Amino acid sequence: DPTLEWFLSHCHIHKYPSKSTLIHQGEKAETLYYIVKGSVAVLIKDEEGKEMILSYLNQGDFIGELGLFEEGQERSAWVRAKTACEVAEISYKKFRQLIQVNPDILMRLSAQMARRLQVTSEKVGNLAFLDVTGRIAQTLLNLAKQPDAMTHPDGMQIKITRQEIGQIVGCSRETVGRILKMLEDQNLISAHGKTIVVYG
Amino acid sequence: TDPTLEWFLSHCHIHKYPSKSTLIHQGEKAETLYYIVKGSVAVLIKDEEGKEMILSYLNQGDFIGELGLFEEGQERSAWVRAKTACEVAEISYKKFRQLIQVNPDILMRLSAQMARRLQVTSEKVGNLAFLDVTGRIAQTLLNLAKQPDAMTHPDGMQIKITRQEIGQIVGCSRETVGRILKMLEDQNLISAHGKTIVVY
Ligand SMILES: Nc1ncnc2c1ncn2[C@@H]1O[C@@H]2COP(=O)(O)O[C@H]2[C@H]1O
Ligand SMILES: Nc1ncnc2c1ncn2[C@@H]1O[C@@H]2COP(=O)(O)O[C@H]2[C@H]1O
Ligand SMILES: [Co+2]
Ligand SMILES: [Co+2]
C-alpha cells in the first residue's frame, strides 16, 4: 500500500542487533518507530526489580507511540530486540505533519494502540482470573503463532527459555519447568529443553 | 473552549444513565463511541464466575467504547458501569470515522486517552505479577498509604477503603479480602478498623 511507502519515505532506518535496547523506560520520548523487520520484546520491571514481558511486537508494528500525544512524555517501557531488527524512525514533529496530510496513517497507528489496550487488559485480568497452568497454556499457543515459530511434522515448534515464559506469565523458572512437564504429560506439547512442539 | 470537541459533539446524541446502571456490556457488538459529558464510571472485567477487576475510573471529558472503532465486528472488551449519574454523548463508529477524515485532531484527542490507559494498565500488570492475592492486597494498601488523602497516624498511615473496593483492585471476592486483612493485621503489617486501615 502507498500510505505505508509514503510514511517510510519520511523515516530513516536503524539496525539493532539481537538483544540490543531500542528504548529505555524513562527516556524523553521524541520519536516514533515502525518495525520493518524482526521482533522486539516490551519489558517493565516491578517495584522489586523483577522483569516482566508486556508484549512482543513484530514486523508491521509501531513502537514509541505512547509519548506522541501530549508534551513532555517519558518512554513507558524498555524495548529490546529479540532478533536482529530493522526499524524505521521518525520525529514526532514530522509525524504530526504527516498526520495532517493523510489521516489514514494515524488510523493505522491508533488501531494498534486499541488492540494493545485490549490485549494488555486481558492479560491483567488473567493474572487474577487464570492459574499459572492456564496462562502458560495460552502463552504457548500464542508463541506458536509468532513469526519465529516453525512448522513441524507434529505441529508448530517454538524456541524459548523457561525464564522467558516465567517473565511472560509472572512465575519462577522452576514453576515453568514443572508446568511444562504437566502439559507434556497431558499430551498438549512435547518438551525438548529450549525447544517445544505445540500441538495446534 | 475546545472547538474540535464541540464540532464532534454536535454530531452526537445524548443519553442519561442513572447511578449503578451499565453503559456498556462486555461481549456486545461494538458499533458506537461515547464521550462523557457529565459523571463518572468504572471500567471492569470479570472471570467466568463474575468476580470483578476494575481497570479504570473515567469521568467528564473521557471517551468510552473506543476500542472497537478501527475494525467493524468487534465486541466490547469490558463492562462500563455508572458510578454517579452520567450523561454521555454517543455517535456511530461510521460517523466518527468520517469526522476523523475531515479533521484528524479528533482522533488525536481520542488516542491521547488510549495511550494513557495503556500506560496505566501496563503498570497494573507489573504490579500484580509475581504475587498471589495476599501479596497483591499487601501491595495495594502500601500504595494507598502513599496517596494524597492518606492521613498521618501515630502507628503509621491511615487510609479508608472497603473490602469490595480492595477486591476490585486485585480481582478477588470481598470474602477473600476479609480473611486476608485479618491475617495482615495478625502479622503486624496493618491494623484494620472497618473501612479504615493503618498501614505500618
Ligand atoms: N502494554 C503494551 N503493549 C504493547 N506495547 C507497549 C505496551 N506498553 C508499552 N508499549 C510500547 O513500548 C513503548 C515504550 O516507549 P513509548 O512509551 O513511547 O511507547 C511504548 C509502546 O510502543
Ligand atoms: N484497560 C482499560 N483502561 C481504561 N479503559 C478501558 C480499558 N479496557 C477497556 N476500557 C474501556 O471499556 C470499554 C469497553 O468497550 P470498548 O471495548 O468498545 O471500549 C472500552 C474502553 O472504553
Ligand atoms: Co534515529
Ligand atoms: Co444512542
Residue numbers in the entry:
A (entry chain A): 8 to 207
B (entry chain B): 7 to 206
Paper text:
CAP (catabolite activator protein) is a DNA-binding protein and transcription activator that recruits RNA polymerase to more than 100 genes in Escherichia coli. The CAP dimer consists of two identical 209-residue subunits, each with an N-terminal binding domain for allosteric effector cAMP, and a C-terminal winged helix–turn–helix DNA-binding motif. CAP has three defined ‘activating regions’, patches of surface-exposed residues that interact with RNA polymerase (RNAP) in specific CAP-dependent promoter classes.
